[PDB]
Short mmCIF file of N, CA, C and O in Angstrom, two decimals:
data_model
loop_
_atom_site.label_atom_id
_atom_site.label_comp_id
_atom_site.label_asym_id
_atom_site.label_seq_id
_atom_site.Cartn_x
_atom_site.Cartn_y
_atom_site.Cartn_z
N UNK A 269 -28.26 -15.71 6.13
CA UNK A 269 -27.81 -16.33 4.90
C UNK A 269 -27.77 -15.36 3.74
O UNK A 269 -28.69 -15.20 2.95
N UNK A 270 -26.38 -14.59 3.70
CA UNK A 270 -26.70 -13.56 2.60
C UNK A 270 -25.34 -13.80 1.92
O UNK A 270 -24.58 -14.73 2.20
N UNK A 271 -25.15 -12.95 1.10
CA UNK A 271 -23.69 -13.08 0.27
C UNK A 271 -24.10 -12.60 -1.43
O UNK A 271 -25.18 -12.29 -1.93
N UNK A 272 -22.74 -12.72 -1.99
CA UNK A 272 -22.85 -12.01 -3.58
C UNK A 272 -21.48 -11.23 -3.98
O UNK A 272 -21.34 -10.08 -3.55
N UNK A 273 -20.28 -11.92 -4.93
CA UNK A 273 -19.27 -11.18 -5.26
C UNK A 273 -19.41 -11.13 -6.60
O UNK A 273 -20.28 -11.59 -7.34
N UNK A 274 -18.01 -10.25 -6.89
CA UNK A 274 -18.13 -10.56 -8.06
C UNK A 274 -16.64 -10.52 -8.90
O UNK A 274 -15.90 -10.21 -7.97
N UNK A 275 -15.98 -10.60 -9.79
CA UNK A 275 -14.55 -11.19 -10.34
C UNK A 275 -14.53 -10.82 -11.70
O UNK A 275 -15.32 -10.01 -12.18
N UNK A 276 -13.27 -11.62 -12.60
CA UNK A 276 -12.94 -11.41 -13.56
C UNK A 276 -11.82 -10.85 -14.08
O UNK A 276 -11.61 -10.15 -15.07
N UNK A 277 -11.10 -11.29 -13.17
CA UNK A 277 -9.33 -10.53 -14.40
C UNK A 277 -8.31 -12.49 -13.71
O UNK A 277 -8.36 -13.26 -12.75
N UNK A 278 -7.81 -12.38 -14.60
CA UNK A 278 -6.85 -13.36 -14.59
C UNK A 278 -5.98 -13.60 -13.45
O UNK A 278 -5.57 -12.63 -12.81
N UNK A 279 -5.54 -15.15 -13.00
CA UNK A 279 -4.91 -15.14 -11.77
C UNK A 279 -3.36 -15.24 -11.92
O UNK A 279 -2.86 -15.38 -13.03
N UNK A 280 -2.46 -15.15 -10.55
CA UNK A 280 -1.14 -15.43 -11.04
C UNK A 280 -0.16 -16.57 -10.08
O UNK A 280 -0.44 -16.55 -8.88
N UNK A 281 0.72 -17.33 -10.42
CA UNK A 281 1.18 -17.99 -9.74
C UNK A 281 1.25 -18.20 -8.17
O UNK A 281 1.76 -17.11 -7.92
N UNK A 282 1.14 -18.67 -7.22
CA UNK A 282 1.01 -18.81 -5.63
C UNK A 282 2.71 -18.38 -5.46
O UNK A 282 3.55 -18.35 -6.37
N UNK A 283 2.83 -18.16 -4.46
CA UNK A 283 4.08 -17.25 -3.97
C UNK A 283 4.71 -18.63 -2.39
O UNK A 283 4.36 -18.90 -1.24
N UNK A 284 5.63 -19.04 -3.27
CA UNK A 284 6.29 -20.08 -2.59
C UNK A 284 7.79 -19.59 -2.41
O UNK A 284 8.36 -18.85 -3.21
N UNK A 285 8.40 -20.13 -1.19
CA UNK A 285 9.59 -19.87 -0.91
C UNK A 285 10.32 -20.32 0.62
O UNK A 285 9.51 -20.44 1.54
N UNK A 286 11.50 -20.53 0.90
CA UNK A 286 11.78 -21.43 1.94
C UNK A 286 12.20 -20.41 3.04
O UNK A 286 13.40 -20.40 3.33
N UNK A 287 11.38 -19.55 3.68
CA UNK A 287 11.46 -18.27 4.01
C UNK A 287 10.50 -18.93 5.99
O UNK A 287 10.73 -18.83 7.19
N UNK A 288 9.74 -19.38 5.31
CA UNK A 288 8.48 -20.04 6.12
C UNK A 288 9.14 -20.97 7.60
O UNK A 288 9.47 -22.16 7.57
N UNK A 289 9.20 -20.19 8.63
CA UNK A 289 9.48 -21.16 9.62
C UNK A 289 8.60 -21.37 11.03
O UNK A 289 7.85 -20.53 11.53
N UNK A 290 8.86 -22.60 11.50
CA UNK A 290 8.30 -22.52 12.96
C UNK A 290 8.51 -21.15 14.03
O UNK A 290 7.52 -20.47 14.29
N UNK A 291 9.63 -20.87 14.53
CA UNK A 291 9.86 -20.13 15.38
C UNK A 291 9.50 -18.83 14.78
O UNK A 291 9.28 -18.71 13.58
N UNK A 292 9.46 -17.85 15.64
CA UNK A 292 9.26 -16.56 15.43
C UNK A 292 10.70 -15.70 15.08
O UNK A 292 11.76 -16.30 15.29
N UNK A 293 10.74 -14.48 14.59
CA UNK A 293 11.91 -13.52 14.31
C UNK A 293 11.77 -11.99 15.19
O UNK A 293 10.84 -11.18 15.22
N UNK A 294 12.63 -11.98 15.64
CA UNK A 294 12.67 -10.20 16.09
C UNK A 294 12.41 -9.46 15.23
O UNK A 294 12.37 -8.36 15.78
N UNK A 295 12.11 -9.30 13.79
CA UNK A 295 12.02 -8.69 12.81
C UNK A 295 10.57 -8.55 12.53
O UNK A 295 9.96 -7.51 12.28
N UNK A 296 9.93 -10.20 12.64
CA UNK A 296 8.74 -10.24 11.59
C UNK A 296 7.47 -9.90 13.16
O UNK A 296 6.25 -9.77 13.06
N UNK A 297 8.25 -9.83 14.36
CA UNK A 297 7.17 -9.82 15.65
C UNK A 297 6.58 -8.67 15.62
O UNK A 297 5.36 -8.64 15.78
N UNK A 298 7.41 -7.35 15.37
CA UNK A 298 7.13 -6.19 15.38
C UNK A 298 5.52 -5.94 14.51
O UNK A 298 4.46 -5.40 14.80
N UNK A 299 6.18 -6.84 13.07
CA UNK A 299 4.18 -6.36 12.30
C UNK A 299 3.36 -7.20 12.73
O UNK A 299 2.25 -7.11 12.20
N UNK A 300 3.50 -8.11 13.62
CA UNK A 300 1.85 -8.81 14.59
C UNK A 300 1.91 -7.97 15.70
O UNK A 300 0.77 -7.60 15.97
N UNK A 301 2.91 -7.42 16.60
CA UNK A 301 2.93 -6.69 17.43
C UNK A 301 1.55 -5.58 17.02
O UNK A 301 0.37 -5.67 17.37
N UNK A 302 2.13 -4.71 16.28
CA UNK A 302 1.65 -3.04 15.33
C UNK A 302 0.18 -3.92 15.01
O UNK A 302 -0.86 -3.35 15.35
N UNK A 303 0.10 -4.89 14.55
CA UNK A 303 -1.00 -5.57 13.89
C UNK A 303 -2.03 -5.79 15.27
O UNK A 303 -3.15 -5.28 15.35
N UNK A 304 -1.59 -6.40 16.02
CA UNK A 304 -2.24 -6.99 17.38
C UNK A 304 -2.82 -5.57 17.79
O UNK A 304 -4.01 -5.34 17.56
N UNK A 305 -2.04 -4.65 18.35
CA UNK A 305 -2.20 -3.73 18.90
C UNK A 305 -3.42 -2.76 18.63
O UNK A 305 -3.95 -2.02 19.46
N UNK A 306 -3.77 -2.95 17.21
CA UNK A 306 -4.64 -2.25 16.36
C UNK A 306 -5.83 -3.02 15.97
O UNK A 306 -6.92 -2.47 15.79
N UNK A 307 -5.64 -4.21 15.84
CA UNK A 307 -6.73 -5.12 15.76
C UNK A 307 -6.44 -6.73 16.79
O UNK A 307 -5.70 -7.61 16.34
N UNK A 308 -6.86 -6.82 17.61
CA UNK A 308 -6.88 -7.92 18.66
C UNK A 308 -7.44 -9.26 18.07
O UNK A 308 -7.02 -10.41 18.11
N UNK A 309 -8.73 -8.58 17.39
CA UNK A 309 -9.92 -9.35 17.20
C UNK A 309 -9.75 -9.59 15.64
O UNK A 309 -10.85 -9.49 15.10
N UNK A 310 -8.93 -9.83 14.90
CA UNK A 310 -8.66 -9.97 13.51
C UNK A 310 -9.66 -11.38 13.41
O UNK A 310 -9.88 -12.22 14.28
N UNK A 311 -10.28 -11.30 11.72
CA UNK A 311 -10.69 -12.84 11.58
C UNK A 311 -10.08 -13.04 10.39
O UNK A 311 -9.59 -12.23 9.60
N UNK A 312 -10.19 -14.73 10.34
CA UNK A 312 -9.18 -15.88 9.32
C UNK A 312 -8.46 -15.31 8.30
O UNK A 312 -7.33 -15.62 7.93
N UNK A 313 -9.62 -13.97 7.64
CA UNK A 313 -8.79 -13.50 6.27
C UNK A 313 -7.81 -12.77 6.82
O UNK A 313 -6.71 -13.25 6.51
N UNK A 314 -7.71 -11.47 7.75
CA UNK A 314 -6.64 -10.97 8.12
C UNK A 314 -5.54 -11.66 8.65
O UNK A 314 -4.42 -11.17 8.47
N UNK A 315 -5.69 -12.83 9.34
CA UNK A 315 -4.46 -13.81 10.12
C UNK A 315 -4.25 -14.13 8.73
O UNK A 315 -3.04 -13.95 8.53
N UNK A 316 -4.84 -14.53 7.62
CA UNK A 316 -3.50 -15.15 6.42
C UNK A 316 -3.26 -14.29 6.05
O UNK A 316 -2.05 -14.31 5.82
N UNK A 317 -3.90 -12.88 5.63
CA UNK A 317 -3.05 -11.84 5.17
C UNK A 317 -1.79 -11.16 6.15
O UNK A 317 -0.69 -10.99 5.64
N UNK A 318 -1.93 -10.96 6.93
CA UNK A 318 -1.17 -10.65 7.85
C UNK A 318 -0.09 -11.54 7.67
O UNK A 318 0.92 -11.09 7.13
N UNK A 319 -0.11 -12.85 8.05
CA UNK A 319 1.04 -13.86 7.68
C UNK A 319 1.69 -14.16 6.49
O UNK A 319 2.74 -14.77 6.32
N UNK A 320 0.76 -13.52 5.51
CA UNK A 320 1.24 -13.61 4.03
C UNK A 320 2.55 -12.76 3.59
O UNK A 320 3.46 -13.04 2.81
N UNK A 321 2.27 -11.45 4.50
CA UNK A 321 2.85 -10.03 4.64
C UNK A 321 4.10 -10.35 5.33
O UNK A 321 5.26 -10.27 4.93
N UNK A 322 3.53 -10.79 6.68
CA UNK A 322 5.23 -10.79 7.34
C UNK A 322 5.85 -12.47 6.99
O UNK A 322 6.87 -12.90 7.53
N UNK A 323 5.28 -13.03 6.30
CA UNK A 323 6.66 -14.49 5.70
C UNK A 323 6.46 -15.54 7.21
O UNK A 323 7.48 -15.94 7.78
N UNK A 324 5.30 -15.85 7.66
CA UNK A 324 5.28 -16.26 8.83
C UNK A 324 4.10 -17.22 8.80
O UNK A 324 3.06 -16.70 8.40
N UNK A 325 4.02 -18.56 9.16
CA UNK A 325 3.15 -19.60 9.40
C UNK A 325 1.82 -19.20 9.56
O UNK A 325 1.49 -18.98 10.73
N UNK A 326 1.14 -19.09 8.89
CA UNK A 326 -0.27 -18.67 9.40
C UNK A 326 -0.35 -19.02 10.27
O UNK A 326 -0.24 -18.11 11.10
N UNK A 327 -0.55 -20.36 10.87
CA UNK A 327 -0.77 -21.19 12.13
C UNK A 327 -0.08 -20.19 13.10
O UNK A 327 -0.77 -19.54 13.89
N UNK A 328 1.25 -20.07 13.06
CA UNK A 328 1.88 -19.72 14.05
C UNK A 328 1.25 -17.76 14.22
O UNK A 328 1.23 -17.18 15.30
N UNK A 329 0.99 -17.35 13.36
CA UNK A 329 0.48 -16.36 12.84
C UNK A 329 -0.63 -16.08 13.91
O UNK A 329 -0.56 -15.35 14.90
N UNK A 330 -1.80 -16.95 13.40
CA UNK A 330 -3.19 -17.14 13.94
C UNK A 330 -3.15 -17.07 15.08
O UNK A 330 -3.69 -16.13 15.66
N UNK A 331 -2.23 -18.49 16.01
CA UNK A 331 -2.15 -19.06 17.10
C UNK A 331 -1.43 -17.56 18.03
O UNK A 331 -2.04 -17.32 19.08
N UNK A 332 -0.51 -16.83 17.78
CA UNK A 332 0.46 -15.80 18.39
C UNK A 332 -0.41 -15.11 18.84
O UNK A 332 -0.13 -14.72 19.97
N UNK A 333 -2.01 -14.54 18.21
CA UNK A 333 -2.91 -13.70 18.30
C UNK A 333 -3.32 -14.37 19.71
O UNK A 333 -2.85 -14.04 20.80
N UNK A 334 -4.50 -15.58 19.42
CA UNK A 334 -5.67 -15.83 20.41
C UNK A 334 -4.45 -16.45 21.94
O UNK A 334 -4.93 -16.77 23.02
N UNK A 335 -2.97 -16.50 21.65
CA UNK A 335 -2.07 -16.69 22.91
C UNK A 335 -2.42 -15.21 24.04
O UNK A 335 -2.96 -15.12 25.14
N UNK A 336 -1.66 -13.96 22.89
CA UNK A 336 -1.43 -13.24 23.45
C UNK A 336 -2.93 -11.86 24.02
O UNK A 336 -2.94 -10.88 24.76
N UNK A 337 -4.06 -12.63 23.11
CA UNK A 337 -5.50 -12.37 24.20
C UNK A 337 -5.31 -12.44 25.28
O UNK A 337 -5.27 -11.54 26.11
N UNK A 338 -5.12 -13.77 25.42
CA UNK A 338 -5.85 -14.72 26.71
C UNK A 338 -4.50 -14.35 28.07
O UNK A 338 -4.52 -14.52 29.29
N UNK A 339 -3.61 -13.88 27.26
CA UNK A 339 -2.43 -13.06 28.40
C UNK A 339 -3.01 -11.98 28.99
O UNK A 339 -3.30 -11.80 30.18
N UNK A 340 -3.22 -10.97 27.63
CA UNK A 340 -3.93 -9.72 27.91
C UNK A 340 -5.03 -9.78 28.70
O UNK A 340 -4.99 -9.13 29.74
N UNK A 341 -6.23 -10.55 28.41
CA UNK A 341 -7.01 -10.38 29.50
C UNK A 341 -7.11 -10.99 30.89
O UNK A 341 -7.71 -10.55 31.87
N UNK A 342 -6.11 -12.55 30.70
CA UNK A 342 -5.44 -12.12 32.32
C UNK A 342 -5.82 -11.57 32.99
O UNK A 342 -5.47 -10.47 32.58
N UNK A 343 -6.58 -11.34 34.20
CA UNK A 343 -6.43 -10.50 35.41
C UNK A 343 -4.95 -10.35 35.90
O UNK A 343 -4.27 -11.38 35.93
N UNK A 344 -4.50 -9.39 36.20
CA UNK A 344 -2.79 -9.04 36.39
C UNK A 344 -2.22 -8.43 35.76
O UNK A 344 -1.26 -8.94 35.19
N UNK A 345 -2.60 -6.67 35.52
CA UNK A 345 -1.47 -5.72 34.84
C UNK A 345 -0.19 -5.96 34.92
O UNK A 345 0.12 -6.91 35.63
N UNK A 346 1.01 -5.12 34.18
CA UNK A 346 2.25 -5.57 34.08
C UNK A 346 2.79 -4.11 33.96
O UNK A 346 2.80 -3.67 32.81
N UNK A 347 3.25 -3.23 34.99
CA UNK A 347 3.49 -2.04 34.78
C UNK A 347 5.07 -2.13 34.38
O UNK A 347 5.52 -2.03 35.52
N UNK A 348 6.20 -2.25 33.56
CA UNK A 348 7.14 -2.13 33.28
C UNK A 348 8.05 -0.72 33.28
O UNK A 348 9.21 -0.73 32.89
#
């Protein structure tokens, strides 16, 4: 049970826009790809930052991660 921040400069409007969809993009896969690749094990704050970054559902964001674990550790390489 520990903790302690600290603050003080002014906030600014939330960042809204109709950009936000269900499905995924060939565009926005690449930075969870680069993202995944480098961190597997991301927690809550990085999945919304991360999703904040590439314009992408957190949910779908979040969820793309703990999918493509549970592929990865799979028993069954995939030599391509």
């Amino acid at each position: 049970g520990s903790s302690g921040s600290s603050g003080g400069t002014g906030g600014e409007e939330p960042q809204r826009d109709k950009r936000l969809r269900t499905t995924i993009t060939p565009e926005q896969l690449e930075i969870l790809y680069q993202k995944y690749l480098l961190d597997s094990n991301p927690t809550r704050k990085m999945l919304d930052h991360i999703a904040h970054e590439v314009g992408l559902k957190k949910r779908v964001v979040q969820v793309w991660f703990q999918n493509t674990r549970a592929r990865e550790r799979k028993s069954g390489p995939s030599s391509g």
